[PDB]
Design a protein around this ligand. Sequence first.
Ligand SMILES: CCCCCCCCCCCCCCCC(=O)O
Ligand SMILES: CCCCCCCCCCCCCCCC(=O)O
Ligand SMILES: CCCCCCCCCCCCCCCC(=O)O
Lengths: 268, 268, 268, 238, 60, 60, 255, 125, 57, 57, 57
Amino acid sequence: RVADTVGTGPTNSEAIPALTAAETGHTSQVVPGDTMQTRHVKNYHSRSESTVENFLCRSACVYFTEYKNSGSKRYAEWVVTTRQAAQLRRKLEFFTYIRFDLELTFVITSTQQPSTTQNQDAQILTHQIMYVPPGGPVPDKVDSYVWQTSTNPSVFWTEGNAPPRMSIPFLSIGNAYSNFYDGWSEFSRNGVYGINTLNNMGTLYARHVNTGSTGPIKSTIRIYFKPKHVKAWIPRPPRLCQYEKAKNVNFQPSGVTTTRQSITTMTN
Amino acid sequence: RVADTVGTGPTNSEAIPALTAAETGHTSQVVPGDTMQTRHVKNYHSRSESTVENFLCRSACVYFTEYKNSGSKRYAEWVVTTRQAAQLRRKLEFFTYIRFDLELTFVITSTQQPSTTQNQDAQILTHQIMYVPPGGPVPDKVDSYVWQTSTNPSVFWTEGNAPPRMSIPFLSIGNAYSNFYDGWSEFSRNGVYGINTLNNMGTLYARHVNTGSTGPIKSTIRIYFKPKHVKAWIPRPPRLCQYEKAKNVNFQPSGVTTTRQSITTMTN
Amino acid sequence: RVADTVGTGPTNSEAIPALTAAETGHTSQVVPGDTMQTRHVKNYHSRSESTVENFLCRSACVYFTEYKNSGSKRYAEWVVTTRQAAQLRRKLEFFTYIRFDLELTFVITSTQQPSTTQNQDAQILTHQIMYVPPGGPVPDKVDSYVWQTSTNPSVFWTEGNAPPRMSIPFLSIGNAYSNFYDGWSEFSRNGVYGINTLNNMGTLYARHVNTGSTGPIKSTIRIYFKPKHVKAWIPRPPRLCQYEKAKNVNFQPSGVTTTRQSITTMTN
Amino acid sequence: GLPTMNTPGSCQFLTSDDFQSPSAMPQYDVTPEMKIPGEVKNLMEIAEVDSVVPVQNVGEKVNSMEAYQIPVRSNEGSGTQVFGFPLQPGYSSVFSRTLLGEILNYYTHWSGSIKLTFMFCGSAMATGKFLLAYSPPGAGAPTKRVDAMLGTHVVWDVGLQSSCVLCIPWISQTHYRYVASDEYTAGGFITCWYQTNIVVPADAQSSCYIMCFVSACNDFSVRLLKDTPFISQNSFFQ
Amino acid sequence: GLPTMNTPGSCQFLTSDDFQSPSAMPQYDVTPEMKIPGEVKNLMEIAEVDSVVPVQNVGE
Amino acid sequence: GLPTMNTPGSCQFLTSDDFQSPSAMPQYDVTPEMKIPGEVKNLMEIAEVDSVVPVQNVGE
Amino acid sequence: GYSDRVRSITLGNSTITTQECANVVVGYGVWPDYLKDSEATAEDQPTQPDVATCRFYTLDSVQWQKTSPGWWWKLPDALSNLGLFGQNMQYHYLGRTGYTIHVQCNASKFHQGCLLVVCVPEAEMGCATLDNTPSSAELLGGDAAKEFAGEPIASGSNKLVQRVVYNAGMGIGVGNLTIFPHQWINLRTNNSATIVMPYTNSVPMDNMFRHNNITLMVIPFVPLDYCPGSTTYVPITVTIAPMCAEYNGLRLASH
Amino acid sequence: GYSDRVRSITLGNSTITTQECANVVVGYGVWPDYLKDSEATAEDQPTQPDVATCRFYTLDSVQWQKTSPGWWWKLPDALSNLGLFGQNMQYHYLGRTGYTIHVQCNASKFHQGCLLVVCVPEAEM
Amino acid sequence: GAQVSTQKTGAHIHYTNINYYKDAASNSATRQDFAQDPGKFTEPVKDIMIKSLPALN
Amino acid sequence: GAQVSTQKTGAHIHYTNINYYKDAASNSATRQDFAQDPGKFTEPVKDIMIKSLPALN
Amino acid sequence: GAQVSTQKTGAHIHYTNINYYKDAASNSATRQDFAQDPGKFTEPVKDIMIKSLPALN
Ligand SMILES: CCCCCCCCCCCCCCCC(=O)O
Ligand SMILES: CCCCCCCCCCCCCCCC(=O)O
Ligand SMILES: CCCCCCCCCCCCCCCC(=O)O
């Protein structure tokens, strides 16, 4: 609950709250009462919306890819990593160390591709989503034994009903998801540099179980991340400069802020 | 519960309930018993239907818009405001100050547009509805990063199942939804005048997630408002004159009531 | 719960834990404390993932077959046996004697076959799955009285909704599902040799209840096995050599392990 | 065989929902937690930290360290103006890139007090007095010291203590204000005026600089989370 | 795994219905209420107020 | 007539799920259990057994 | 009694005295402490000298001119070549320590200026060219202060770090750097700045060579000014003292 | 603890801070107080805002040259054209108030001089 | 934690309600609040005027 | 084994929650943890500095 | 007749389970049976051999 102001009356004392020393590195907490007379106003406002859990707990689309029922690309492959979407990456970059569980929803939408094949009879498409942890086998082809998934987790979904959704625990060899890593892979100090060192989260594949019809059909899958039970450590300043690459923090230098007319202008 | 009449018998007293003074501004509450003999009739009738909650708690369609899978208009934009539908606006105008929560249901219906493209294979259309609060980004195009919705609320809906529905709390910087505002925006007294001053509720966009087929498909979305936990203050007289604009109360003068033959006619 | 190490300090005693006798057939359990000084580190790690139930309780696809609405093959026949899929067979071969209940899920996906028949009107296909125990009648034809299933268990499924799923108890005349059988059927010692002796689990048929349309439609069914309440006895060494046949353990001899440069190379 | 009935709103994908979901990896032994210093539990713990304000954002000054410095020199007159800006934390270019502003640009509404900490960065012999003023709306901005004197003002004397705090209170008609621009919820104007002068001894510089930090009071609140209009992507970065 | 059965009347949009619905904005701090004079709690409080009657509604 | 509402994630086939399912064969008398030596209850009981290491894996 | 501007700090066999200093800032409210037994992961016994490892090492001094943009230091790298702390972090595999930072810049009453001393944890820095990443010889300078730049670095292919000052190299507003523990040395009042950073990392122990946690940054917000007649060479000195240092995994010398 | 040279004064919505100030002089030992009922003569009810009327009004500044003889101000007249104190003393007939006087003149360590600030009551000239 | 209340039936039977969502703005519409106070709009005069009395004595 | 808790409503009603999945990582997001401690970032100095005191005596 | 048990969560909350089918082979998979006994495979010798002793005296 938000604090409430306390009523105050005219004062004339040597001690002065307003005058302090900002060189100490201390934020001087001054109630409006110190610099002017105030009346007792109770505050019934709450800080409920601000909490880290309510700020980060909203579904956001990390990446979307496409696959075709018949054609050169029959299966889709994506290395599961964040930093591909600016909206979520910026929100996560606020804290150096983060630790959260995750909820994943897959919005799969199909569409017909233009062709010349006649006598089309569309049938309910079925989509299989598979997750390969770092080290497992890779389906070099859309039809391969790897798709048996004797151990890997997978989800099958027929088109027409509610989207798939699963919950994922905190998968990390450390004690927190590091967002920034100022170091190299080799102790030699030569090699991969940056956060891409700590990205070994696996890969996610998707395919069509059954060929829908004779005419070509293209399906696009979108992946949504929902942080749950989130904990944040070491707060950091907000980005400011637009992102360029998804493997590092390389950027182009940009002005501190938008300019105005003069130093006494009240309008942008 | 409705009150019941009390039995009365012939009287001959100086005090007279019927004669009063209407200049005082007081409604003389006279039971039928005062002006004639009455018998004791118990009333089991109830005023349950009249209550403000039961009067305003019925779904009503505020606005409907259209978007096309392929074509110039691929996304729909609507500033969320009331006063576009006469049936609900008239009901709300009864009270100067209103305060209610809201339930929103979106009836999305698609249809095929006439064309010449052959070999059509229709696929389940998916519709995304997004709400941008006042200040957020705007999707200048149907395909844009804004549609990631990292913070904004959104709903995805595949065609074929029950319609979407969400509940919205009381969003207002004041303590009540003002229905009438006799003032300007500028303290200069020149500028926007009327209720349009207090309408900053945001915007609502909608789009097709996946192109359904080769042939053009047009979809229309209707929005329904359902007030919940409603409170009303300062009752007002009913409209009478038909509405003209959705930004003010400008009207064309109309007769008090429909006329009749004479002052002693019993028929319209 | 994982055990925790105990702190130790420099020692100089005749008794030596490191030196033992490996000819006895005993695994010398030596804590890191015996061969070097260690500090007291509590271990909060758990062995929950390893348990036999969590290792074998994951759905795995044993076999998939195809049937056509109109054509030479109108029904599918499969002898219910494991050892047709390498991923699950290898996992099961770890223990000589296994005893588990089973959960079966059937992913049935249809597709249209290319043809010349015009004016196609696709209709919801219905799929019937039937299990014939060893000894029952066999549907020599897709249309036959056997499909009445007055006693056999069966499942009917219309295309468009969630996949079928059933639970099966422990069906065996013995006390455990034997995985290896070093013997013959005849006491003469001439005849079927190996594990195929103990495979009399029945047969599983599947058919289309209604012809979908005029144009040919091919449907493929995949069968998934999910072990429940599993118990394992007599642990065995892992396969190593790729499987060749599904009726025995015949194999082609393969090298112990992949080679390297020399005996002091640190890289593959 | 329990007879049920689905209601409108079934089989939908609402973004800001909170339900339960079956886990893809059952019986996972999570890595235990450890004590890491500086745990955040609420975003208003970041808004209460002082943030350097770029008051001098004029032209090219935004592309150097000269944006955070406010020039003050020994004048030949008195009563002139040093700087001024509107009270628009989530909109004005002055407060847009401050930590407080960066936090506010995520939430539609805001309420509470503000604390402007001014630090004089001149020599040790230079003395002076300044008049900080906050004038609520109703009229235009003040143009002369006789007009900003009537607002809420705090005279500041430069001395041993080199830091002064201006507590902009909460004087409004509505419980909350919009972070976006709206004339219905105008904020006010913050103006600083020379009180007497800036006098220096011989062989000391007569042109000094002042810095300003913005922070929120113990009674700050935010509401209605929205997307920020600052970050944008043309395509998926790769 | 509770076995259920949908009844006639499912997945419909009835106008005068009263059910529960997930909120689009969770954990919202509603602006507190204040005392505003003249609160209406029933429409028959308006019907009991005198209203001028246009008895002479003849022609112009 | 209990009004419900399906959530995202319905009518899906998740691989590593744990629900209940109606049995195809009701009232089955399972063959009783017997004591068979060497019962495994955890895979780390196999990892704690000595395994010969092929250190000299050079060429042939 | 006494005043708050005077402070004395003793560590190992070294002492630091200040007569015009502000209040010490102690990290995020945590004083550096040894690794508890309910948090460790290495089963080996650690080594803790706590005298040779923990002491005030004085680095090289840099000159503060009227056109100086700022300097940055890496705490693990700077002390890697100085004393037994360097020898130990070199002979071991895992190390753990907190640090005490003291910055000394003194000027008379007729000078003016202001410095920001900030300890940024995990300061990943962007390269000048988007495709390449910075090299190990450009990012960290052993016992050397890498200076910043007033104007943007060229975008031509190179392994140079983006040294533009108004973005701090990490791509942020230099104004919002305050969120981290920081001190202000204004030549009007303060003559020194003290910071006490605990061990901030996502693991119990990490290798010092391939991971530099904290990056001290000094930024002159308000430039230095004076009139002719005053001394123009005003240096800046930085003294770093390790605290509660321990190690694990004794291995053959590695450099 | 603290020193006596630092002082802060708050009145209405205005504040005055000084870091090198001497001890405040409080008139003839009497702090200004409202008119008691055993001393009044007007039988009408008085009006007392005490917020708009009571606050630090800053007047115009004058330059101190090497040949400046001095300056004088009249407290009722100076504030007659500034804020609600001016509006009230203009719309009424009888007024009553005490005054707080603050004079600010700052110079470095290398200047010299001395000023006398005196409040003369009833200064007929 | 269920709430049992009465049903609105004719004149001259308990129903059950459970809240599932934790926002307090998702509850069903409260329809049974049959309370009134017509003293604000009708008879709003300062001095009480008894029914059978000369309103203006 | 149900858990009854309070709803987040305005100022100036209990809801029911039951856990069905046995992984403890499938529970709903815990949204009501309104606890704070701004002493780590603001006023982080070693020696306490009272508000109305000469910060540097 | 419900069964309340504990959830598998991290180190350093009760869930509910009800059986609906009456075959006892339809229950959910029992995943929490963390019991072991490595004495059968490791150290299976007839005569006990203490750790720090000459295995062959
Ligand atoms: C059908 C597939 C189900 C399982 C899919 C799991 C994919 C996500 C794996 C965990 C990723 C957690 C986030 C890592 C990135 C980060 O922390 O920045
Ligand atoms: C998927 C979008 C969900 C959210 C949509 C919210 C749109 C409505 C916002 C609140 C409007 C309340 C009514 C304001 C107008 C009035 O009171 O007259
Ligand atoms: C609609 C059909 C339902 C019944 C289908 C039952 C098919 C499976 C029968 C039991 C097989 C159990 C496994 C035997 C093989 C093995 O143990 O290795």
